Amino acid sequence: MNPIILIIILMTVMLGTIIVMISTHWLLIWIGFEMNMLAIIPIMMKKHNPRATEASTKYFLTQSTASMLLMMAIIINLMFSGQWTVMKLFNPMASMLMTMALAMKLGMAPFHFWVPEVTQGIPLSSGLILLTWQKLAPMSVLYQILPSINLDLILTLSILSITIGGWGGLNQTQLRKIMAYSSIAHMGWMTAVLLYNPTMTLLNLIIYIIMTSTMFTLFMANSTTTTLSLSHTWNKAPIMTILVLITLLSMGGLPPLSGFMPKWMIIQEMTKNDSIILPTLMAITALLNLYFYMRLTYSTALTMFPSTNNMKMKWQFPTTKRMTLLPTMTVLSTMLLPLTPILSILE
């Protein structure tokens, strides 16, 4: 765990993701997914508990079978019309198994069984880097091979993923599993609008990664895992709590706050197509996955739990961490309401 070695491994994460971005060849995309796996494994098990051991094992098996199924889809693609371009493919079977492999990759309701497990027993920096980069990786892929996908696959994945993230989530006590289930629901959202306009998908990717960076930066600012320590951080620091208030309500996506803008524009360009019952059922589920956000905000900032002392002893001592960039990213993530024609940034 030398800092030179960790800067090297961060450079490999960056390099694997950029190879996923720029390479028009399928083999190099598979190599990029593999190299990103190989780099993200020693980010986890930064400690040496068996928790991180089991977490990295489960994540290794899931990412490995995703990589193998992707290579299967590419080999079937060249058994059919065979060219090494990232283009509109020429097989329902190959695109079928490829979307299933990407569902293994980014997590869907068929394939979400590893996510709260691997996100619980790890440090939060590892959870941040895995969530941000491993959900940024398939978006380039979908953004380039949208025109040859049977829509029922991704639609069933999206519906079922958002309703599993709605139902699973109202019972948990760990913040890591809360953020994991939220990642499940929002990746279902950001995958749902693929075959109509990928602009909404990419912009929602931007907004969600900014939100998760702010959230996990706040939870780096206090080594907390349950609501109890969150109330203790209320009793030692007030401004963290109003940050939790505003950011959690933006994760709820409420119209004066910036998190509603990726929802609302998705509803716009999904309901200019004349299917209505499916977007409003998905928006009912987006109502449904706000309860745990709200009770979390209750137990942090708005209700006040009693506390044990020695926080008096902590009061002489500053909250003297350094942040990567917390406040700038927070006010970007929350006060971004009148910047709706910044949708036009893409093309």
Partner 1 sequence: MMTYIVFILSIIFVMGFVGFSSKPSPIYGGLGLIVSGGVGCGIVLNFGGSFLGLMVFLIYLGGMMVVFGYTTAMATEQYPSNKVVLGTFITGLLMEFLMVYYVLKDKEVEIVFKFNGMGDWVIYDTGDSGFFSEEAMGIAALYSYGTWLVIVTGWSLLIGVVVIMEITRGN
Partner 2 sequence: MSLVYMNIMMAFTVSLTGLLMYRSHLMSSLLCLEGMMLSLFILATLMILNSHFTLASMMPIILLVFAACEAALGLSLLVMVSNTYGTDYVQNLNLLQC
Partner 3 sequence: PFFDVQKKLGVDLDHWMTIQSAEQPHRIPARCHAFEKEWIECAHGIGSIRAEKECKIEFEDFRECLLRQKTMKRLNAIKRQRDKLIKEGKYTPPPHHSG
Ligand X SMILES: CCCCCCCCCCCCCCCCCC(=O)OC[C@H](COP(=O)([O-])OCC[N+](C)(C)C)OC(=O)CCCCCCCCCCCCCCCCC
Tokens 């990759």: give the residue: 105
Among partner 3, ligand X, partner 2, none, partner that 67 touches (CB below 5 to 8 angstroms by kind):
partner 2
Kindly write out the interface string for residues 100-139 of this chain, putting x where it contacts partner 3 by CB under 8 A and - elsewhere.
---------------------------------------x
Question: Contact, 195 vs 151, CB < 8 A?
Answer: yes
Among residues 51, 123, 144, 336, the one that binds partner 2 under rule CB under 8 A: 51
| Closest-CA residue to 219 (of 252, 269, 159, 178) | 178
Among residues 78, 304, 311, 339, the one that binds partner 2 under rule CB under 8 A: 78
Secondary structure in 3-state letters for 105-119: HHCCCCCCCCHHHHH
Residue 335 main-chain phi, psi, to 5 deg: -90, 25
Q: Counting contacts by CB under 8 A, is residue 60 touching partner 2?
A: yes
DSSP letter string, 192-220: HTTTT-HHHHHHHHHHHHHHHHHHHHHHH
Q: Considering the complex, what minimum distance in angstroms separates the CB of residue 187 from partner 2?
A: 18
User: Under 8 Å CB-to-CB from 268, ≥6 apart: which residues?
Assistant: none
- Binding segment for partner 3 among 81-89, 97-105, 230-238, 321-329 (CB under 8 A)? 81-89
Q: Considering the complex, what minimum distance in angstroms separates the CB of residue 264 from partner 2?
A: 33
Q: How far is CA 200 from CA 38, 258, 267, 269, 340, in A?
A: 31, 15, 10, 8, 12
List residues near ligand X by CB under 6 A: 274, 276-277, 280
List residues near partner 2 by CB under 8 A: 27, 30-31, 34, 37-38, 41, 45, 50-51, 53-57, 60-61, 64-65, 67-68, 71-72, 75, 78-79, 82, 84, 113, 116-117, 120-121
